Write a protein that binds this ligand. Structure first.
Ligand SMILES: Nc1nc2c(ncn2[C@@H]2O[C@H](COP(=O)(O)OP(=O)(O)OP(=O)(O)O)[C@@H](O)[C@H]2O)c(=O)[nH]1
Ligand SMILES: CNCCCOc1cc(F)c(-c2c(Cl)nc3ncnn3c2N[C@@H](C)C(F)(F)F)c(F)c1
Ligand SMILES: Nc1ncnc2c1ncn2[C@@H]1O[C@H](COP(=O)(O)OP(=O)(O)CP(=O)(O)O)[C@@H](O)[C@H]1O
Ligand SMILES: Nc1nc2c(ncn2[C@@H]2O[C@H](COP(=O)(O)OP(=O)(O)O)[C@@H](O)[C@H]2O)c(=O)[nH]1
Ligand SMILES: [Ca+2]
Ligand SMILES: [Ca+2]
Ligand SMILES: [Ca+2]
Ligand SMILES: [Ca+2]
Ligand SMILES: [Mg+2]
Ligand SMILES: [Mg+2]
Lengths: 351, 54, 418, 438
């Protein structure tokens, strides 16, 4: 039978993958530092990639891609977008963004374009973000550049500033904002599998163009709408709307599909992001092999243009779908290398 | 792709290929080290021989 | 050229020791006359480890035979190879030890020990580079136990920088032929804890079960038990007697097998495809110390395969048992299982596999003896025969405390995590 | 012409030395009896091959080599081997009790007893040198002699020859061929003691050599002889510039200046290609661009790591056989298109290239096929620090419980040398991180 170890115990996804592997009857769990494992469900930070693939007589597999950080963090993503020829500084699907450090830095880059559209009195509302902040904090929106990096020199972590989606597609009834989360699995062969089931994580209060103050009309994060929200849960339970019903809404309300209207842009952004880093993270001929589950975050404007806003390398799933996805991980990423004894839920994106 | 410092001879060739420009203890201390180790050994052998004499 | 001196004391030690010289003499192609008549010449490349070379290329075992009564040493002089030994290396008394450790260590044995170290000292000075000593003996009697450990302590005083190995027959859990064996065994264990580098623990109940259940001998004898031991003594010493490099001398073996100086008591095993042997070698029913390894964890392990076999398979099979049974190996000693392969097989077999485990499950043997010892010592039963030879009671207390400490240490490391 | 002296310490060091010297003799045309028919400077010469070979009036060519082990089993097979008459018995030195896989025993106990005789016999070879470059030291990390006595000798060579350069060829320990549980301890203790005395050290992880021999030579369970025959190849291609006419790495000092901009980070990664099995009926030659591209695949490295996740500070390319600069710059340009090759800011993104027209020499009967173009890559990449992370962790697991430490204290070493040596490699691992990571 096969062995595996668990080194990030607060992962909802791989907590359930662990439980399903044991129910196999063909997998046994050692503990943290027993090195004689077949599969490592590793930690999030400073995972020891250098110690994998050096155990004689054991094909070893890990659920993270060494190097996938340059895509799963904001500062890194913008540097990746603007410096990779494959993805262009003129990239169409990624919002105008600039890396800027508090106290290599595009701050004079940033206001060059700021005044350029003030001259044209075009929309000039930007947003600043970071990897450290959470809980809808360390986040701010406003129209005047002056005190938005008056606001990040007020901190000491690297933050990015990003043109704000001022005309987003807004669900009705409600006039409310939303995000789209798609889960993608990259297996050891670097097959790019897209989970057929996505989720729209929604805001439950009408989008107010007039003031950016209260960040529950603006920030679709699951927790701020669970936490500073009257009507969290009115239209859909948990501010979670799934693709079947979103498809019906776009059809009924705008005479278009989901697949046509949005999904083709998502699949294109995923291919482009992950094929750009394949030469740098592929483990095709490595002494160990990797797989990883990513969570892509998109936003849609009113013209049904899809924008990528970030990628999450240690993502959580939606409660209704933990069962289906987590077992897909087992069949495609784990049992692919470690066969067991005796339709599909993913969209393969070819390359 | 510059090819500088080319040198040739009957046995072969050498050259450089730029792609992009940029942006101890004393001898005395040693034996003092090996004598302090030899001391510690014999202190250990002595305590054993004393213990066995007991 | 890295010579060993072999000593055998007491009846058990001399019987086991005698058959040990039978087995390895045949392996090295030596006949009872001391003359070589073998096929290969790897039989002779390291013959100097155990044999002194003498006139007319007669090879004489570097062996010393000790007892307090002459009986058992007349038997060996009568045996198949009784004539191979140097007649001056028979060192014998007439009183006996009376199953009494005090007599063997302090009184009857004291009178004879200086003559034994006279022979040991002459052997040792005919050695180009003495490696160490190995002794075969019983712990339950009086000579091998009491005088055996006196010889050890006296040898350590003259050769404090040489290796000391023992093959030690220990009391069995259920079987005994003497009442006071718990006292003799405990007093000797205390000596071994402090003055040996490696001890192979053997008990007769395990050796018997193998003989009866496995090799299907209907009425096993000490002679059958003794051929088992001598076969596994040949195995554990193969890497010392034939050209190799893993565990090729006594000190290198000790460095790889003893992480902590007091935990140097080993579980020997023997067997009998290649997946066959490696499964046998690790089964409880194939080890000779009456401790089940699944009740502890291996600190280190040494596996020795003999014969001609696909070393690729052997390498693959040992890896599988480790990765299959990781729970039984300490995680804080990386790569603690080492494998050696020698081409010359034992006689009768074609592929051997002898096992040397340093398992914390050896704890069970010392707790068996400790429980017996205490049940007698709490009432001072039979003790007057020991204090009657001059011993103090505190010598028994100290021996009891040390063997109980040893058990706590084994449990400490059985529990440790990374 | 300046001379180099090779020192072979311990079993691994000696057996690898004897494979290197047999290979040198075939490459230069020296026979087992030391006679060089092609040499017309009798009893003398300042030819570049004289950097490694002395010359007798009788016409024999003697390696500038000293072999030392503290037990005689290994060195005596040199005294009886087919190249026995190559050496003077004074170049071979034996103890009789070895270090028992115990660093402290080879360094303190036994090393003290023999170090002065080794220096004398080294001095006798240095005496007949008109201008000594330095020393190339071959040893293992795991052995007691390889680790313990080697570090003591480097300390002494740094004073008896304070200005000369010292290069290391070190065998990193791999469990599939390793002899002792304590090799992590011996590796760390000797690396700490030797680090400030080594100018440039090429470490070979026996694991990588082992699996190359399995995968590319179809040897199902490789021996030391198979490992050493491939190792000698890589060694020879690295030393070829000292023994043949050229203008790159013609001096031990050049190795450091070309490859080691940071004194502590003196561990270049070697990658070799092509390794082709000689019994395979035959193969169609590989391009210059193909073997050059093989040099960036981890399966061809002497140490298995991922250079993509670090930074280079130097890179040399050593070709042997049918190669010309045109095909090289074509391979490099096209290979920088498809590979992740990131240098440090502080250094130019470039390759020093050397070509020797003599195609690689192979030993008769060996498992490696005669090719007509081979390449060895020397890259100083921070990714090799993965090898220190592996060892440091094995060291940590055992040392947390003081497993086996009593064997070292018993030899007169103090427990504090353990912590001292471990803190040094903790620093080293972090130095490697500041350089190659953001
Ligand atoms: N590649 C290669 N590795 C070797 C060779 N000999 C030994 N080793 C490796 O080196 C380690 C053992 O060290 P040795 O060189 O045998 O020990 P030593 O230097 O002679 O020191 P002591 O015998 O302890 O005095 C193990 O990791 C072996 O795998 C060899 O000939 N070639
Ligand atoms: C199912 N688990 C039961 C294991 C049985 O374990 C054993 C071990 C032995 F060593 C013997 C044995 C032998 Cl084999 N030969 C002998 N010659 C002289 N005495 N003697 C022996 N024992 C003496 C004490 C006795 F006979 F008085 F019992 C034996 F019989 C059973
Ligand atoms: N350029 C932009 N324009 C408009 N809205 C934006 C935006 N960038 C982000 N947002 C909104 O602000 C919210 C928070 O941004 P962000 O996704 O980076 O925080 P986060 O890192 O906590 C998401 P997760 O918790 O999934 O990792 C997003 O849900 C998005 O709706
Ligand atoms: N295997 C084996 N064990 C023996 C033999 N003789 C005695 N023993 C064991 O040792 C004990 C008796 O010890 P013995 O050697 O006679 O005592 P000694 O002569 O005083 O050293 C009993 O527990 C037996 O199990 C023998 O020939 N073979
Ligand atoms: Ca008397
Ligand atoms: Ca006397
Ligand atoms: Ca000449
Ligand atoms: Ca120096
Ligand atoms: Mg985030
Ligand atoms: Mg050696």
């Amino acid at each position: 039978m096969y062995t595996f170890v668990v080194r990030d115990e607060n992962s909802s996804v791989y907590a359930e993958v662990s439980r399903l592997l044991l129910a196999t009857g063909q997998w046994k769990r050692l503990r943290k530092d027993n090195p004689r494992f077949n599969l490592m469900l590793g930690e999030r930070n400073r995972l020891p990639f250098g110690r994998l693939g050096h155990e004689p007589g054991l094909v070893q597999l890990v659920n993270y891609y060494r190097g996938a950080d340059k895509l799963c963090r904001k500062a890194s993503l913008v540097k990746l977008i603007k410096t990779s020829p494959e993805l262009s500084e003129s990239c169409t699907w990624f919002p105008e963004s600039y890396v800027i450090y508090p106290t290599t830095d595009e701050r004079e880059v940033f206001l060059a374009a700021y005044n350029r559209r003030r001259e044209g009195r075009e929309g000039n509302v930007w947003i600043a973000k970071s990897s450290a902040g959470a809980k809808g904090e360390g986040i701010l929106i406003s129209s005047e550049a002056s005190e938005l990096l008056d606001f990040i020199d007020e901190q000491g972590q690297v933050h990015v500033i990003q043109k704000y989606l001022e005309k987003p597609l807004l669900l009705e009834p409600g006039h409310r904002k939303f995000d789209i989360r798609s889960w993608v699995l990259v297996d050891h062969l670097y097959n790019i599998y897209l989970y057929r089931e996505g989720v729209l994580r929604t805001s439950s209060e009408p989008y107010n163009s007039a003031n950016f103050q209260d960040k529950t009309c603006h920030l679709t994060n699951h927790c701020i709408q669970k936490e500073y929200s009257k009507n969290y849960g009115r239209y859909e339970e948990g501010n979670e709307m799934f693709f079947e019903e979103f498809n019906q809404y776009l059809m009924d309300a705008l005479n278009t599909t989901l697949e046509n209207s949005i999904l083709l842009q998502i699949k294109h952004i995923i291919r482009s992001c992950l094929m750009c880093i394949e030469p740098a993270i592929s483990t095709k001929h490595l002494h160990y092999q990797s797989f990883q589950l990513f969570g892509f975050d998109f936003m849609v404007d009113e013209e049904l243009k899809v924008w990528l806003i970030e990628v999450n390398g240690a993502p959580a799933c939606a409660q209704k779908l933990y069962a289906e996805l987590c077992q897909g991980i087992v069949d495609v990423a784990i049992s692919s290398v470690f066969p067991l004894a005796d339709t599909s839920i993913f969209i393969k994106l070819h390359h | 792709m510059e090819v500088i410092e080319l040198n040739k001879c009957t046995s072969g060739q050498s050259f450089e290929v730029i792609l992009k420009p940029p942006s101890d203890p004393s001898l005395e201390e040693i034996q003092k080290k090996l004598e302090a180790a030899e001391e510690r050994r014999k202190y250990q052998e002595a305590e054993l021989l004393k213990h066995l004499a007991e | 050229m890295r010579e060993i001196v072999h000593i055998q004391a007491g009846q058990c030690g001399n019987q086991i020791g005698a058959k040990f010289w039978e087995v390895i003499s045949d392996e090295h192609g030596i006949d009872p006359t001391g003359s070589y008549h073998g096929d290969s010449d790897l039989q002779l490349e390291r013959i100097n480890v155990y044999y002194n070379e003498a006139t007319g290329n007669k090879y004489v075992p570097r062996a010393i035979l000790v007892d307090l009564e002459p009986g058992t040493m007349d038997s060996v002089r009568s045996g198949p190879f009784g004539q191979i030994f140097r007649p001056d290396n028979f060192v014998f008394g007439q009183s006996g030890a009376g199953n009494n450790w005090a007599k063997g260590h302090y009184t009857e044995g004291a009178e004879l020990v200086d003559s034994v170290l006279d022979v040991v000292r002459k052997e040792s000075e005919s050695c180009d580079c003495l490696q160490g000593f190995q002794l075969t003996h019983s712990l339950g009697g009086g000579t091998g136990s009491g005088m055996g450990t006196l010889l050890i302590s006296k040898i350590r005083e003259e050769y404090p920088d040489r290796i000391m190995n023992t093959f030690s027959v220990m009391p069995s859990p259920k079987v005994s032929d003497t009442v006071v064996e718990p006292y003799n065994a405990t007093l000797s264990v205390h000596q071994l804890v402090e003055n040996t580098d490696e001890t192979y623990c053997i008990d007769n109940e395990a050796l018997y079960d193998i003989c009866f259940r496995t090799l299907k001998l209907t009425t096993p004898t000490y002679g059958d038990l003794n051929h088992l031991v001598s076969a596994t003594m040949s195995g554990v010493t193969t890497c010392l007697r034939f050209p190799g490099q893993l565990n090729a001398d006594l000190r290198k073996l000790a460095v790889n097998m003893v992480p902590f100086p007091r935990l140097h008591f080993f579980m020997p095993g023997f067997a009998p495809t290649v997946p066959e042997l490696t499964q046998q070698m690790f089964d409880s029913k194939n080890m000779m110390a009456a401790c089940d390894p699944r009740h502890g964890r291996y600190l280190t392990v040494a596996a020795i395969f003999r014969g001609r076999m696909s070393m690729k398979e052997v390498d693959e099979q040992m890896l599988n048992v480790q990765n299959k049974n990781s729970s039984y190996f300490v995680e804080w000693i990386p790569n603690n299982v080492k494998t050696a392969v020698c081409d010359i097989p034992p006689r009768g077999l074609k592929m051997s596999a002898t096992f040397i485990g340093n398992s914390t499950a050896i704890q069970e043997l010392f707790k068996r003896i400790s429980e017996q010892f205490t049940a007698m010592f709490r009432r001072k039963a039979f003790l007057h025969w020991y204090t009657g030879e001059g011993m103090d009671e505190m010598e028994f207390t100290e021996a009891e405390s040390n063997m109980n400490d040893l058990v706590s240490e084994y449990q400490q490391y059985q529990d440790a995590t990374a | 012409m300046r001379e180099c002296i090779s020192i072979h310490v311990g079993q691994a060091g000696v057996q690898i030395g004897n494979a290197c010297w047999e290979l040198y003799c075939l490459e230069h045309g020296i026979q087992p009896d030391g006679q060089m028919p092609s040499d017309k400077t009798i009893g003398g010469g300042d030819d570049s091959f004289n950097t490694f070979f002395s010359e007798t009036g009788a016409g024999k060519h003697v390696p500038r080599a000293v072999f030392v082990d503290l037990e005689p089993t290994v060195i005596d097979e040199v005294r009886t081997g087919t190249y026995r008459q190559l050496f003077h018995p004074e170049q071979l030195i034996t103890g009789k009790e070895d270090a028992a896989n115990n660093y402290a025993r080879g360094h303190y106990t036994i090393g003290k007893e023999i170090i002065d005789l080794v220096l004398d016999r080294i001095r006798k070879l240095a005496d007949q040198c008109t201008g000594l470059q330095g020393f190339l030291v071959f040893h293992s990390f795991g052995g007691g002699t390889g680790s313990g006595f080697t570090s003591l000798l480097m300390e002494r060579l740094s004073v008896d020859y304070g200005k000369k350069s010292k290069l290391e060829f070190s065998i990193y320990p791999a469990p599939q061929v390793s002899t002792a549980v304590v090799e992590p301890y011996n590796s760390i203790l000797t690396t700490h003691t030797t680090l400030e005395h080594s100018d440039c050290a090429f470490m070979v992880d026996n694991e990588a050599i082992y699996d190359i021999c399995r995968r590319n030579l179809d040897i199902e369970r490789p021996t030391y002889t198979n490992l050493n025959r491939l190792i000698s190849q890589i060694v020879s291609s690295i030393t070829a510039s000292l023994r043949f006419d050229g203008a790159l790495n013609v001096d031990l000092t050049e190795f450091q200046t070309n490859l080691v901009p940071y004194p502590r980070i003196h561990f270049p990664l070697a990658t070799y290609a092509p390794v082709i099995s000689a019994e395979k009926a035959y193969h169609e030659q590989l391009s210059v661009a193909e073997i050059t591209n093989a040099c960036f695949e981890p399966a061809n490295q002497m140490v298995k790591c991922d250079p993509r996740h670090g930074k280079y500070m130097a890179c040399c390319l050593l070709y042997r056989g049918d190669v010309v600069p045109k095909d090289v710059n074509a391979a490099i340009a096209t290979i920088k298109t498809k590979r992740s090759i990131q240098f440090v800011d502080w250094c130019p993104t470039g390759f020093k290239v050397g070509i020797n027209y003599q195609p690689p020499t192979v030993v008769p009967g060996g498992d490696l096929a005669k090719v007509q173009r081979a390449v060895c890559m020397l890259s100083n990449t921070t990714a090799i620090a993965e090898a220190w992370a592996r060892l440091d962790h094995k060291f940590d697991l055992m040392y947390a419980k003081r497993a086996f430490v009593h064997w070292y204290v018993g030899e007169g070493m103090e427990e504090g040398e353990f912590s001292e040596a471990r803190e040094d490699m903790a620093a080293l691992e972090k130095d490697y991180e500041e350089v190659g990571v953001d």
